[PDB]
């Protein structure tokens, strides 16, 4: 009812989904507290380089360039991972959450496996390009003059590199999950 | 003569670049490795194929040790348990 | 076999031998009690008791 | 927190 | 005329250099001593062979 319906590949998929869920929530929190862009006006014995910008202007610049520069995928990566893991969990548990299904069962399971495989394929295909997109440093040329007087700004994102680190490992996890499904897919198309 | 924003920016940059990665990841690294140890220890029981044999052996050994007829022989209902004993001996051999 | 004078229970397969070694590491007396049910003469006697 | 600044005005800061 | 950053830097440096290690590590040392103690005491029960 709860345990016998878990083959070893199913247990592996469930545990991988659990681990990637904990990764996703961890990233979401890290965004919650430490995700803060930090910006400075770019274009200018050694002395200081005082820019006579009071605190409020620094905050406004931070937010303006944080929206303008930092990539949307870079911003939403933790949300992305969390949403994908919730979708994986829900599509795994829908086999028993469906009131009717509590040979159409086999077709529903095949459809769920195909959905998981396609999700893995799409995730890999777009993450391959997107992972390199996030950068630690960043440059924004935003017309903020008449408000600070500067126009070219260099910023850096606190979690960026950290995220990329985690992101890289995340990629591998996805492949593994797909491979597991692949085996199950083979079990669905080699033995019938 | 450096404002606060410059100081925080300097902290962020020099933290990412200068400070070595091992210092930045040592606790998570150790945590990962101890998880690997715990998982490799637990997989000996989390693998159902051998887990069935292990659990059946636990049950049969507990029943056989609990049987007072064993000690009596060392000097009733266990007759039915003899069949389970022989079946387990043959199968898990 | 030398203790209870029972010549049955000669040996065991690889799995049983190793897992018996593990049990002995845990508790030899558990091995002693578990061995009893392999004795064929014991089964004959207990079948006679049931009869 | 709507963050606000005054608007109408090598470069330096715009100390207000 | 030292900005706050220099004050924190001085605090941390003189913390690591001057202040003796006993003050820094005394609580953690106490934790390790206590954990060794109650582990050694509980090992009487936790050892299955005599358990």
Numbering used by the authors:
A (entry chain G): 16 to 59, 95 to 152, 256 to 345
B (entry chain F): 102 to 176, 236 to 253
C (entry chain F): 355 to 405
D (entry chain A): 51 to 59, 95 to 101
E (entry chain E): 102 to 152
Quoted passage from the original study:
VRACs are hexamers composed of five closely related paralogues of the leucine-rich repeat-containing protein 8 family (termed LRRC8A to E). In contrast, when expressed on its own, the LRRC8C subunit forms a larger, heptameric assembly with weaker mutual subunit interactions and a different preferential arrangement of the LRRDs.
Differences to WT become evident upon comparison of maps of LRRC8CV390L to wild-type LRRC8C homomers processed without application of symmetry.
